[PDB]
RNA sequence: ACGGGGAAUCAGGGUUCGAUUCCGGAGAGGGAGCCUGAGAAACGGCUACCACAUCCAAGGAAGGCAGCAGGCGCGCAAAUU
RNA sequence: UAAAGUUGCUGCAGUUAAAAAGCUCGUAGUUGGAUCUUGGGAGCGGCCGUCCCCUGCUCGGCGCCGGCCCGAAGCGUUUACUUUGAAAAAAUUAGAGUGUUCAAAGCAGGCCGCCUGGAUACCGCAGCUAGGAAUAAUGGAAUAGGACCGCGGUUCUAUUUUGUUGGUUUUCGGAACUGAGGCCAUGAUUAAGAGGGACGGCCGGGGGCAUUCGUAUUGCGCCGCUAGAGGUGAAAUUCUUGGACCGGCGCAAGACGGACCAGAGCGAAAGCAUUUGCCAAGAAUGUUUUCAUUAAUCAAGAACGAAAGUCGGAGGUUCGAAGACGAUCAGAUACCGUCGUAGUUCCGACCAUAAACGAUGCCGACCGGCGAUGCGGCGGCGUUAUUCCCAUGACCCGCCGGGCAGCUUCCGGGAAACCAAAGUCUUUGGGUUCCGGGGGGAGUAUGGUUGCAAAGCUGAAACUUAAAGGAAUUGACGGAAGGGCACCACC
RNA sequence: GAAGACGGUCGAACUUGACUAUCUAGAGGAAGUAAAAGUCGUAACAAGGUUUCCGUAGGUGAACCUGCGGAAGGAUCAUUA
RNA sequence: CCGACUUAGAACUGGUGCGGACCAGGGGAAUCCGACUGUUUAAUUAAAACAAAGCAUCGCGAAGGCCCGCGGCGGGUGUUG
RNA sequence: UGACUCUCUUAAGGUAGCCAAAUGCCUCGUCAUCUAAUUAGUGACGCGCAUGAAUGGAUGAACGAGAUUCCCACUGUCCCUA
């Protein structure tokens, strides 16, 4: 620190408090503008209704179609692109399905190729998208 | 208390005449209505009677001054300038 | 301006040790400097000094050895309890073998070792190793 | 370094070590006092007195010959100025500067040097009030300072 | 945002959490007013109004699970009438 | 949450990577020079280490002859600090005992009825308590309303006393008040390589006001002699036999202050250069002057603040945003050229911003060398001037203090470039202010506020993104500079 | 001694207004950011072909240009009586 | 002891009636025009028209500008600059 | 849609603004808003028959026996007359 005086606790504390807002990880957490914009509203997972299937173009270095799903949440009515993981998992996902949707890993930042796709599909109609992939369950229709 | 923020003597004109013409008039209106120190007695009694004519209330001595001020900036430079031409003519 | 006469003295003897001068002049003398110097001397990190006595804040000429690694002040004077003294000497002295925190107790200016024996803490002055 | 300047000048009087009376001076403490009362009567500041003393009379310091210093001597008799002699000159310098700005409003540096002088008057005032040598209701007043020269 | 005892991480400092079994406070759908009593502004007491909802032979009557079970809803999220 | 010394109290940064307010003043805030009790005694284990002492004034005993000690209580500048004692729910944490068969746990258990547990520590601050008296505050006596003494008196007046009966002032005891003289060494540290102020001779493109000069430029009056002039890379628009350009005399106007002019000076910065006068100011030096901590740095607040811009008045020589044309060009509403508006100038108000830069906050300390320079002072051979000396200028050789700088080096630092400051930094704390937290979005939107406006100050978020950036290296490149070589270059 | 009534009192509650926080529609306008290969030029980086940049003005399809004053982060640490 | 007009507060009271007659502003959100006050077609148009301050052009140094008059050494502006 | 280009062409080709305005023929323009329904109103959009800078442009607080539109309140204006 700078001001060292023995009776300087209120300046050192109030300075540290004022200058803590200039931190990104702080002001994002401690102003609720991030949480108001967060489609999950602070939730880890969220359920939502599949309403179409988007073929997202990857970033320039990697040219391929990332088969995502436009999901509308049960709790918000907010619309979301959710990346369907794996080779052929999208085939198990049809329009109007309660899919459980999680974040991708980077705590609300777009991951790798997919531009502005922050979420992924975990379960489809209370049946895990891993189990459908492995062939340990089947889609109840 | 302070009554008006930024009008003064020209609060009497209300909303009339325009802000700039009320502002321009203010600088004059203060000076012409101001009482000035009589150079002859020192009493702050030089009040403007009419245009160009100032009168000490105590001396009862009238001075031919400016329209809105006791001294005009020009006539102060002329009195200085005439006095220096006077020092050169007289040698 | 000069707001710690002890600090502007300990640094003055430290710059001379870093350079290798055989004796150093330290312009303002206080009883606090002399008491700091005498504690360094009983442990033998300086040779004998002499306080030059003007009718003012005196001067001191300290006869430097080359034993003093660093002589450093602590400003402000953090009051120290015996339960907190071990944590000070953890992160202010090099090893638990040598080096001394001096601190002004009620029983007089003296090193943390002498301040432990008397079971009496006080306000930290500085240190030397 | 100065108060109101970037100067860090080392230029002040340096007393000799020995505080004894010098063994040539024929002035006794009683006769130095009677000489200060002779000079203080003339309208002379404690500063101006002590100069005249060490110049043309050889009395180096009054504090070494007598026990008391010069203002402490003036005051014990009752010839001392009411407001202090240093505060007087700052008030005097301000009144001089302000009379210069009565005709020179263009002078931005005389206006700036005024604020530094004006600041120093309000700064010695808050010193001379804590020492109870000015009355607590003492205010520096630009309008009325000219008659307190 | 009930507070605290505490909790997690932790060299030395700290940082964060503490609805949650102990202590103290508060409230019983929202307010408000009272009765009895040593102790209540009590709600497994009462009376009002509001919201909600019940049985009715349509005149009226009756209610209060932030008790334990359980149901519905809400949801990423939680047990046996 | 650690990692994150990427929130930095410990402990980060701010010349160039993000970052020091343009500048100074200034109140809270924070921080503040030195200085007042030490010297001995007297016993202790082997010159040496250690215990102990450097207050005062009614109750009861180791009592003793109105005097003497030890001990119970009330008491005594205070706070911060430190140590100590107290009180401080358990559970949890730490931790003692303890084979839940181990362990998490549990508070049990163990010996042939008996024996033993169920401790203890910790519990920020704040409060209570008893030391310590260094440090940091803080207090007294300076018109002595002064400590300490007994005296003189003024009154309300305990109860010890005038046989039991009553009264008085009484002695007598406290409470408050005066008149004296006596007494102490009668009382005020020092004078900061802190500061303010006085003073002395000075110094400086410091500031203001008036004055004065200089050439140029422009326009004009006239006088020459003439066909071109001007401008350019080349031209053209443009001026021109109605005499241009040029040369000569004058006159008028408004700018500007060349050379001298420097890595020189001055100022808070912005800035400041003809003469002379006037006005107040200022640093530095000199000081055996004065005051005696008055100080440093500073939220809020305030003065100044280049240029451009705005407002009103005067003026408008030159230059010249806009505008017009001539060129150049594919275009050229640009560079070039010819004109020319606002502006540029002055007076009075506004604006408050710059690469306002040393991209480097201020105050203080310390840490190498050298030769210069500016200023003041000091001293020292000799040359020169007023010559006629004396004192003064001009040189010369130093020293000292502040000042703008320079070179030098393994002080040391730094990512390096570089830096005697950007050092004295993991061996981390002299004081204090402002300010940074990956790049964008953005100095944006929004609200507030200031302004005539332009805009100034304050100032987000959603979203976006894996880099942006610094220094240095090597190549490649250059419509940069140099040095070569070659009849696949030239002569 | 019941109902009931005057007045006082606490005061739910609805009605109206005002303020305040939050969420949200909107013609049209004007920005930001992201795209593997749109159009027009070439503003910047080499003296980037007019050094660049800063502040402030005005102008221009667009980058930008130009006036005024600054800066070197320059393309000169230097220019000789 | 001489007081002369009010102001505030309270009690009670009437069939909620009381500025009891009289006197005596409907209000709000917007557009257009003219800044405003002023003026105007007496006898159909009071307006947005005219005027106005502000602004900006122009002429004129008097033997002059502007203007009058049949005339003049005429006259107005002009007791002017 | 046309920043850009090409040509014709003027003394100069309407800039900053503003707008179906008291100025827009077409026109009851198109979109939004106000309504149950709006040739009206306001807000926008401009290739604007034929806007536009002291023939002044754009604004505009205060003002108005000025010209409009809507809302509240009010009411024999009306239902529907007595």
Curated annotation (Swiss-Prot), chain A:
SUPFAM superfamilies: Nucleic acid-binding proteins (SSF50249)
Residue list for modification 3-hydroxyproline: 61
Domain of life, source organism: Eukaryota
Residues recorded as bearing N6-succinyllysine in the entry: 53
GO biological process, one term: translation
Regions that span the bilayer: none
Keyword rRNA processing assigned: no
Places the protein is found: Cytoplasm, Cytosol; Cytoplasm; Rough endoplasmic reticulum; Nucleus, Nucleolus
Main location as per UniProt: cytoplasm
Subunit text: Component of the 40S small ribosomal subunit. Part of the small subunit (SSU) processome, composed of more than 70 proteins and the RNA chaperone small nucleolar RNA (snoRNA) U3.
Protein name: Small ribosomal subunit protein uS12
Gene: RPS23
From Swiss-Prot, chain B:
Subunit structure: Component of the large ribosomal subunit.
UniProt binding sites for Zn(2+): 38, 41, 56, 59
Keyword Metal-binding: yes
Record bears the keyword Repeat: no
Any one GO molecular function term: large ribosomal subunit rRNA binding
Signal peptide: none
InterPro entries cross-referenced by the UniProt entry: Ribosomal_eL37/eL43, Ribosomal_eL43, Ribosomal_zn-bd
Pfam family, one: Ribosomal_L37ae
Entry-linked PANTHER family: 60S RIBOSOMAL PROTEIN L37A (PTHR48188:SF2), 60S RIBOSOMAL PROTEIN L43 (PTHR48188)
Known role: Component of the large ribosomal subunit. The ribosome is a large ribonucleoprotein complex responsible for the synthesis of proteins in the cell.
Localization, UniProt: Cytoplasm
Designated name of the protein: Large ribosomal subunit protein eL43
Zinc finger regions, C4-type: 38-59
Keyword terms of this UniProt record: Cytoplasm, Metal-binding, Ribonucleoprotein, Ribosomal protein, Zinc, Zinc-finger
Family: Belongs to the eukaryotic ribosomal protein eL43 family.
Cellular component per GO, a single term: cytosolic large ribosomal subunit
Swiss-Prot record, chain C:
GO biological process, any: translation
Molecular function GO terms recorded: structural constituent of ribosome
Secreted listed as a keyword: no
Family designation: Belongs to the universal ribosomal protein uS8 family.
Subunit composition and interactions: Component of the 40S ribosomal subunit. Part of the small subunit (SSU) processome, composed of more than 70 proteins and the RNA chaperone small nucleolar RNA (snoRNA) U3.
Function: Component of the small ribosomal subunit. Part of the small subunit (SSU) processome, first precursor of the small eukaryotic ribosomal subunit. During the assembly of the SSU processome in the nucleolus, many ribosome biogenesis factors, an RNA chaperone and ribosomal proteins associate with the nascent pre-rRNA and work in concert to generate RNA folding, modifications, rearrangements and cleavage as well as targeted degradation of pre-ribosomal RNA by the RNA exosome. Required for proper erythropoiesis.
Annotated protein name in UniProt: Small ribosomal subunit protein uS8
UniProtKB/Swiss-Prot annotation, chain D:
Posttranslational mods: Ubiquitinated at Lys-26 by RNF14 and RNF25 in response to ribosome collisions (ribosome stalling).
Keyword set includes Ribosomal protein: yes
GO cellular component annotations of the record: cytosolic ribosome; cytosolic small ribosomal subunit; nucleolus
InterPro entries tied to this protein: Ribosomal_uS15, Ribosomal_uS15_arc_euk, Ribosomal_uS15_N, uS15_NS1_RNA-bd_sf
A matching Pfam family: Ribosomal_S15
Residue positions where N6-acetyllysine is found in the record: 26
GO biological process per UniProt: translation
Subunit composition and interactions: Component of the small ribosomal subunit. Part of the small subunit (SSU) processome, composed of more than 70 proteins and the RNA chaperone small nucleolar RNA (snoRNA) U3.
Protein name per the record: Small ribosomal subunit protein uS15
UniProt source species: Oryctolagus cuniculus (Rabbit)
The encoding gene: RPS13
